[PDB]
Design an enzyme around this catalytic site. Sequence first.
Site, PDB file in Angstrom:
ATOM      1  N   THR A  19      18.622  46.378  72.374  1.00  0.00           N
ATOM      2  CA  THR A  19      18.422  45.915  73.937  1.00  0.00           C
ATOM      3  C   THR A  19      17.323  44.989  73.701  1.00  0.00           C
ATOM      4  OG1 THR A  19      17.548  46.811  75.773  1.00  0.00           O
ATOM      5  CG2 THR A  19      17.120  48.100  73.634  1.00  0.00           C
ATOM      6  N   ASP A  20      17.093  44.223  74.777  1.00  0.00           N
ATOM      7  CA  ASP A  20      16.282  43.055  74.824  1.00  0.00           C
ATOM      8  C   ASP A  20      14.747  44.041  75.369  1.00  0.00           C
ATOM      9  OD1 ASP A  20      16.546  43.767  77.626  1.00  0.00           O
ATOM     10  OD2 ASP A  20      17.212  41.546  78.159  1.00  0.00           O
ATOM     11  N   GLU A  21      14.992  45.051  75.618  1.00  0.00           N
ATOM     12  CA  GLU A  21      13.874  46.001  75.973  1.00  0.00           C
ATOM     13  C   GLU A  21      12.647  45.937  75.123  1.00  0.00           C
ATOM     14  OE1 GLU A  21      14.462  49.262  78.665  1.00  0.00           O
ATOM     15  OE2 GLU A  21      16.379  48.701  78.446  1.00  0.00           O
ATOM     16  N   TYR A  73      12.513  55.129  75.551  1.00  0.00           N
ATOM     17  CA  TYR A  73      13.519  54.806  75.104  1.00  0.00           C
ATOM     18  C   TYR A  73      13.810  53.295  74.396  1.00  0.00           C
ATOM     19  CZ  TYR A  73      18.162  52.511  75.822  1.00  0.00           C
ATOM     20  OH  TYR A  73      19.419  51.754  75.456  1.00  0.00           O
ATOM     21  N   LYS A  83      15.057  52.669  70.413  1.00  0.00           N
ATOM     22  CA  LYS A  83      15.560  51.422  69.897  1.00  0.00           C
ATOM     23  C   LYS A  83      15.158  50.473  69.123  1.00  0.00           C
ATOM     24  CE  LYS A  83      19.327  50.769  70.355  1.00  0.00           C
ATOM     25  NZ  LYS A  83      20.981  50.771  70.179  1.00  0.00           N
TER      26      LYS A  83
HETATM   27  N1  LIG Z   1      24.301  48.861  79.042  1.00  0.00           N
HETATM   28  C1  LIG Z   1      23.347  47.992  78.992  1.00  0.00           C
HETATM   29  O1  LIG Z   1      23.124  47.252  79.923  1.00  0.00           O
HETATM   30  C2  LIG Z   1      22.821  47.824  77.730  1.00  0.00           C
HETATM   31  C3  LIG Z   1      21.897  46.680  77.626  1.00  0.00           C
HETATM   32  C4  LIG Z   1      21.304  46.490  76.438  1.00  0.00           C
HETATM   33  C5  LIG Z   1      21.509  47.108  75.201  1.00  0.00           C
HETATM   34  N2  LIG Z   1      22.770  48.095  75.262  1.00  0.00           N
HETATM   35  C6  LIG Z   1      23.206  48.720  74.282  1.00  0.00           C
HETATM   36  O2  LIG Z   1      24.582  48.939  74.306  1.00  0.00           O
HETATM   37  C7  LIG Z   1      24.866  50.105  73.608  1.00  0.00           C
HETATM   38  C8  LIG Z   1      25.837  50.860  74.320  1.00  0.00           C
HETATM   39  O3  LIG Z   1      25.297  50.896  75.691  1.00  0.00           O
HETATM   40  P1  LIG Z   1      26.286  51.556  76.764  1.00  0.00           P
HETATM   41  O4  LIG Z   1      25.381  51.212  78.133  1.00  0.00           O
HETATM   42  O5  LIG Z   1      27.434  51.013  76.629  1.00  0.00           O
HETATM   43  O6  LIG Z   1      26.136  53.106  76.518  1.00  0.00           O
HETATM   44  P2  LIG Z   1      26.799  54.570  77.243  1.00  0.00           P
HETATM   45  O7  LIG Z   1      25.498  55.067  77.693  1.00  0.00           O
HETATM   46  O8  LIG Z   1      27.717  53.789  78.282  1.00  0.00           O
HETATM   47  O9  LIG Z   1      27.580  55.031  76.228  1.00  0.00           O
HETATM   48  C9  LIG Z   1      27.246  55.839  74.919  1.00  0.00           C
HETATM   49  C10 LIG Z   1      28.205  56.167  74.049  1.00  0.00           C
HETATM   50  O10 LIG Z   1      27.723  56.966  73.004  1.00  0.00           O
HETATM   51  C11 LIG Z   1      28.099  58.058  72.659  1.00  0.00           C
HETATM   52  N3  LIG Z   1      27.230  58.894  71.983  1.00  0.00           N
HETATM   53  C12 LIG Z   1      26.041  59.226  72.697  1.00  0.00           C
HETATM   54  N4  LIG Z   1      25.468  59.993  71.823  1.00  0.00           N
HETATM   55  C13 LIG Z   1      26.190  60.042  70.470  1.00  0.00           C
HETATM   56  C14 LIG Z   1      25.855  60.603  69.264  1.00  0.00           C
HETATM   57  N5  LIG Z   1      24.933  61.405  68.941  1.00  0.00           N
HETATM   58  N6  LIG Z   1      26.991  60.610  68.526  1.00  0.00           N
HETATM   59  C15 LIG Z   1      28.189  59.975  68.841  1.00  0.00           C
HETATM   60  N7  LIG Z   1      28.262  59.163  70.104  1.00  0.00           N
HETATM   61  C16 LIG Z   1      27.446  59.732  71.037  1.00  0.00           C
HETATM   62  C17 LIG Z   1      28.400  58.453  74.293  1.00  0.00           C
HETATM   63  O11 LIG Z   1      29.428  59.540  74.154  1.00  0.00           O
HETATM   64  C18 LIG Z   1      28.875  57.477  75.040  1.00  0.00           C
HETATM   65  O12 LIG Z   1      30.259  57.369  74.929  1.00  0.00           O
HETATM   66  C19 LIG Z   1      23.492  51.034  73.098  1.00  0.00           C
HETATM   67  O13 LIG Z   1      23.150  50.800  71.747  1.00  0.00           O
HETATM   68  C20 LIG Z   1      22.929  50.342  74.202  1.00  0.00           C
HETATM   69  O14 LIG Z   1      21.079  50.274  73.914  1.00  0.00           O
HETATM   70  C21 LIG Z   1      23.272  48.609  76.538  1.00  0.00           C
END
Ligand SMILES: NC(=O)c1ccc[n+]([C@@H]2O[C@H](COP(=O)([O-])OP(=O)(O)OC[C@H]3O[C@@H](n4cnc5c(N)ncnc54)[C@H](O)[C@@H]3O)[C@@H](O)[C@H]2O)c1
EC number: 4.2.1.46
Lengths: 344, 341
Positions: free
Chosen positions: B134-136, B160, B164
């Site tokens: 993430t950009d954070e 968090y 990351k």
């Molecule tokens: N959503 C955003 O705006 C965003 C922004 C920046 C970066 N990201 C990155 O994108 C990636 C996905 O983000 P998202 O928002 O789609 O996530 P989410 O929270 O929607 O999904 C998390 C998924 O991971 C699975 N999961 C969690 N813990 C687990 C573990 N121990 N073992 C296996 N599966 C597990 C959960 O069941 C879920 O399906 C992340 O790495 C996140 O940091 C997301």
Amino acid sequence: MRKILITGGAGFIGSALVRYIINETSDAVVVVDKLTYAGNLMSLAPVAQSERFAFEKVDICDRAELARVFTEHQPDCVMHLAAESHVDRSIDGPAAFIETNIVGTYTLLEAARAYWNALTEDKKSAFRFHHISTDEVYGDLHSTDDFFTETTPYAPSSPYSASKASSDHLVRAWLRTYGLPTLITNCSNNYGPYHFPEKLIPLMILNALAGKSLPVYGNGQQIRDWLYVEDHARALYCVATTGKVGETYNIGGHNERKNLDVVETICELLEELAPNKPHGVAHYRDLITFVALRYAIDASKIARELGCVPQETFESGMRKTVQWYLANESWWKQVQDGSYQGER
Amino acid sequence: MRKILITGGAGFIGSALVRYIINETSDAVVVVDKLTYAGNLMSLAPVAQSERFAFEKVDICDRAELARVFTEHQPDCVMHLAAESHVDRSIDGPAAFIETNIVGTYTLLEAARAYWNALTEDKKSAFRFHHISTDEVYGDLHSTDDFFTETTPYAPSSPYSASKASSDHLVRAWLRTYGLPTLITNCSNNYGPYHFPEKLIPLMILNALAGKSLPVYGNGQQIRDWLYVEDHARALYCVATTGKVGETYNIGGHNERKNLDVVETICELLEELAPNKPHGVAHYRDLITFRYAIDASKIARELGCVPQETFESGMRKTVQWYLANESWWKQVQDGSYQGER
Ligand SMILES: NC(=O)c1ccc[n+]([C@@H]2O[C@H](COP(=O)([O-])OP(=O)(O)OC[C@H]3O[C@@H](n4cnc5c(N)ncnc54)[C@H](O)[C@@H]3O)[C@@H](O)[C@H]2O)c1
Ligand SMILES: NC(=O)c1ccc[n+]([C@@H]2O[C@H](COP(=O)([O-])OP(=O)(O)OC[C@H]3O[C@@H](n4cnc5c(N)ncnc54)[C@H](O)[C@@H]3O)[C@@H](O)[C@H]2O)c1
């Protein structure tokens, strides 16, 4: 009387810090060390019988034991030095370096946060959490005139340094998120008394004394900044007691020495201090074998702000170190023996 | 055909990636998701019937199970999106965000290492380990003209983001240390289909459709770059299949939009798409009460991957989706989603 809780207080650097505090201060200490291969109670012996000295054989990952200690000793400050430098197999679960360094730092942060959070306004503003890290978090130098500063981006390159970088991020985030008063210091390679036999400097000394090859890789041109243990100890205490919350301070030996210089020096010093050489050895320097990167710190912030500069030079420190080894053979031998572990 | 192993495949971004691969590629996938509150099998339903689809309900922290999965499916590439967004206290052991985000990335890295180490030289070199971040990690911006670049120094401000950042470090170190072919992508805030109801954009839509107050905090002038989930997914596949080992690529929406903008845009969109206002609701706007930008030039330049939608374009599609998929969000709000297939 300040009560300071020091993790890894039985290790190389931690033990020096402990000896300092008791010998050159009126403060008290509580050592928290689980005693891994790296811990050595013999390095504490010198000041172990002190009134201001207390030892807790606890694992930083044991939240409960941790809370207890905090409850019982009521430290006014925490100095976190406990860390694992070995990178073991992952075949049976997370390796110790991940647990200790990252998980253990998180646990300690939470244990302290809990304690702090229940402190009186007075003890609350004064409390301090001092985290000790490494300059390896800065990664590599891309010039011959660049130095690592407190503002160099992080770029850890090994599992171990990646592990340390993570801990730093956590320490920084607790302050920003929860207000826990944290500070961080990054240092260069330390050397000095009570350094484990298998380490670089100590290794060279001991092998030479033994008449064994003195392995030097590459051109032997790798440059490092060597910080004397005692000097490190002194700066830590300074940062803790006078350092400013949320600040980072690099701590270095103020030098740049090539590896070959290191070995030559040791040889040169041995010739003088250990005249009678091993069987069939003309000159110690004859043992140097070529079985074929720069790392330098800029510790001006600390000097400027806290006015604490190293007291030794590579030269003065080396001499002291060599003398120590020759004088304290019982120690290194016990460690090589393995008998150190089973000590009381 | 490539067999890609995607962790967190049932999550918001992950599910969009899975759908893209099945629908617009000829590749196969093996989803590895433990299904926490954030996971939703229903977001996978649309493509779950492909023979190119596989699901493994496994926790990335389980070394034994990961070993089994790699051995059994033999992926050619790994896309790691599993992460824990919730930060909760923990009186015994590390909290989930720590365990999953850090310990879990380490676990996965080691499982992949063990597998790759035994691959044939040819397969070995073609293997890829793509990590999502993430950009954070970049922390705060000091001006109003500065953007986050791949080379901005890390300064994670929260537990968090700290978790990351840590994960990012391990990924880089694995390459430098063991030679594991890793690469990283950092992105801004995503929005779009299958986004959880509790989320900002989705919340705004639903609350508006339900005649609830549209709380605009401050002056609603906080700026953020918004990335459309589908655009994010296409970019991730691109990086993963054509990206350069050891590089890092930022992914952004190519925009800067203020909160009020967002909100107003939604209202304006509902007024046209949802003409049938709630009870005692003339205009959607009247529901309203009272800097983080990314530079993604690199990827565009080198990989040639550029966002396809605009904030406008994107939001339109987002609202329509919500209108068209009440079954989904309702089952989420219901909690019934946790008991799906
Ligand atoms: N959503 C955003 O705006 C965003 C922004 C920046 C970066 N990201 C990155 O994108 C990636 C996905 O983000 P998202 O928002 O789609 O996530 P989410 O929270 O929607 O999904 C998390 C998924 O991971 C699975 N999961 C969690 N813990 C687990 C573990 N121990 N073992 C296996 N599966 C597990 C959960 O069941 C879920 O399906 C992340 O790495 C996140 O940091 C997301
Ligand atoms: N030695 C150097 O050159 C150096 C250089 C830069 C930074 N540092 C930092 O200074 C610190 C001291 O380094 P060092 O060489 O003195 O380490 P060390 O290996 O000599 O000692 C570590 C001590 O911590 C203890 N320990 C390990 N895990 C523990 C756990 N889970 N709970 C409780 N105790 C535990 C061990 O028993 C040992 O006594 C470390 O944080 C290190 O990153 C060291």
